[PDB]
């Protein structure tokens, strides 16, 4: 799941505070969040491919 990944991600953001050079490290993390969130809405969008040839 995403939640293991995200706990480690946001914890690492608050660790990234304690250094500087996370200039685009955090931007890579944001991108990883984006596409992760994209698959989750993807999985919610899906309908079974075949028509319901029972009714329709």
């Amino acid at each position: 799941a995403k939640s293991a990944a995200n706990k480690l991600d946001w914890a690492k953001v608050i660790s990234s505070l304690r250094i500087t050079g996370s200039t685009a490290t955090q931007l890579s993390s944001f991108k990883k969040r984006n596409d992760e969130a994209r698959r989750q809405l993807l999985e919610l969008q899906s309908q079974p491919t075949e028509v319901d040839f029972s009714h329709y």
């Binding site: 690492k12 990234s16 250094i19 050079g21 996370s22 200039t23 685009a24 490290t25 890579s28 993390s29 991108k31 990883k32 596409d35």
Partner: protein, 85 residues
């Protein structure tokens, strides 16, 4: 996308910190200091390191050597008074 690798290299918070200058100082200063010393007062040892020990220690500013040395000069010219008499 994959988190960047700058945080996995450190060699600019390890040499890039101000107390490093103090560290290399106080590893030399303190490590190489004998915790205790030899003896505070000992100059003129011939039973006159004892004179120093009683009078010229930093444990006293007592007026006794002053008195003693003064009395010496009184003894010096006074004896010579009776030598010149």
């Amino acid at each position: 996308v994959s988190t960047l690798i700058p945080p996995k290299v450190v060699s600019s918070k390890n040499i890039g910190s101000a107390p490093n200058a103090k560290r290399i100082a106080n590893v030399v200063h303190f490590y190489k200091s004998l915790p205790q010393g030899p003896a505070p007062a000992i100059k003129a040892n011939t039973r006159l390191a004892r004179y120093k020990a009683k009078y010229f220690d930093g444990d006293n500013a007592s007026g006794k050597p002053l008195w003693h040395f003064a009395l010496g000069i009184i003894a010096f010219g006074y004896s010579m008074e009776y030598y010149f008499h």
